[PDB]
Amino acid sequence: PDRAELAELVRRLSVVHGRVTLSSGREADYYVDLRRATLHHRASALIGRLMRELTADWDYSVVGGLTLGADPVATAIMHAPGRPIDAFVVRKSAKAHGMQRLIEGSEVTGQRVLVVEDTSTTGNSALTAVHAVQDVGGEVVGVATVVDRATGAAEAIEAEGLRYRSVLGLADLGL
Amino acid sequence: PDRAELAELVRRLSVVHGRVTLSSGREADYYVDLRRATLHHRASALIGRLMRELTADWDYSVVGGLTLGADPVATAIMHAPGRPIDAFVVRKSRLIEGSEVTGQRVLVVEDTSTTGNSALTAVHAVQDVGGEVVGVATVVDRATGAAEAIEAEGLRYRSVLGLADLGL
């Protein structure tokens, strides 16, 4: 029921129907804004729960990713029922202070880390977080995401020796 | 107990004592890394509870502020028990992500700040889109005029913690 409850909320909240002229001059009939679910009271509590179950067999104390598409997901996982898991956010530029200048939040040095994102087209953003955690001495145990969009992300993440899992898929969006 | 236990988590996770050089060149005897608290599993859960208690007499359906500092606070409030409250995020540079703020009563959040400019930016961004801001709540007030700046704009300001809870 949860996967289906979430899947429906993602469709309703995040598939934004309506015609739009892009900067290129092409028109699209819809676009996919996952931030609308990841920041919704109900969809986020489901995301938290389901991403915990999805990764239950992985060994990690810390969850995080690349701002902003990761923050709400990571915090959802942190707040969801179960064993303690802390969070972190990889920035795009360097903090003024500390010994992990691209990483807000919890100390990832010497921890096993889950890397998350709401959705990835290329896996660029996820891998940017993976390497940022890596450069500071964190063990990335895998990457997980709310929605796979079958656009190359899995094979890009798998190419660097890392597991990839998703709660939802292209079919769950309708389209 | 909740407030006392958060205070202790904020001292232990976020108040970094020792001679330090700021980005300006100024030397301080400490700095505050409030995000280690806002991204910690226990402290964030207390933040959501306590920020909800703190603003229980205000009417708002949506909570959020300027990225990154606000997002961990906004989602802790959203995930905390009680009546449903959605979240939003004001970007620095399409300004508002997440839940709709237009036509809604909105709580602007900040983890902490010396000047309140970040809070103000979020307030202004919500106003430009037809949201009504009911006030600003923060985790830590630094007693450096943030409050009064927010009050000059006709907005109520509140904090869970203050300067004295940070043992300086």
Numbering used by the authors:
A (entry chain A): 4 to 178
B (entry chain B): 4 to 96, 104 to 178
Give me lines lifted from the publication on this model.
The inspection of the catalytic sites of the protein crystallized in absence of ligands revealed a bulky residual density located in the substrate-binding pocket I of one monomer of each of the two functional dimers present in the asymmetric unit. All efforts to unambiguously assigned such residual electron density to any of the substrates or products of the catalytic reaction proved unsuccessful. Given the predominant nature of the mononuclear dicitrate species at physiological conditions and the presence of iron(III) and citrate species in the crystallisation solution of ligand-free MtOPRT, we manually fitted the FDC molecule in the electron density with satisfactory results both in terms of ligand geometry and refinement statistics. However, both approaches gave unsatisfactory results, poor fitting scores (CC < 0.7) and refinement statistics, prompting us to conclude that a mononuclear iron dicitrate is present in the MtOPRT active site. FDC is held in place by hydrogen bonds involving the non-conserved Ala99 (3.5 Å, long range H-bond). These interactions contribute to the stabilisation of the “flexible loop” of the neighbouring chain. Moreover, FDC O7(2) interacts with the amidic N- and O-atoms of Thr124 (3.1 Å and 3.2 Å, respectively), while the Oγ of the conserved Ser26 forms hydrogen bond with O1(2) of FDC (3.3 Å). Noteworthy, in our MtOPRT structure, the conserved Ser26 is shown to exclusively interact with the FDC molecule, and does not participate in either OA, OMP or PRPP binding in MtOPRT orthologs. Moreover, in order to further support the structural data, we performed thermal shift experiments that showed a stabilizing effect of FDC, not matched by either Fe(III) or citrate alone, with a KD of 1.6 mM, well below the concentration of Fe(III)-citrate present in the crystallization buffer.
The fifth step in the de novo biosynthetic pathway is catalyzed by the enzyme orotate phosphoribosyltransfrase that synthesises orotidine 5′-monophosphate (OMP) and pyrophosphate from α-D-5-phosphoribosyl-1-pyrophosphate (PRPP) and orotate (OA). Herein, we report the X-ray crystal structures of MtOPRT (coded by the rv0382c gene) in complex with PRPP, inorganic phosphate and an exogenous Fe(III) dicitrate molecule (ferric dicitrate, FDC) at 2.25 Å, 1.90 Å and 2.40 Å resolution, respectively. In all the structures herein described, both monomers composing the functional homodimeric unit are related by a 2-fold axis, with a solvent excluded surface between monomers of 1045 Å2 (13% of each subunit surface).
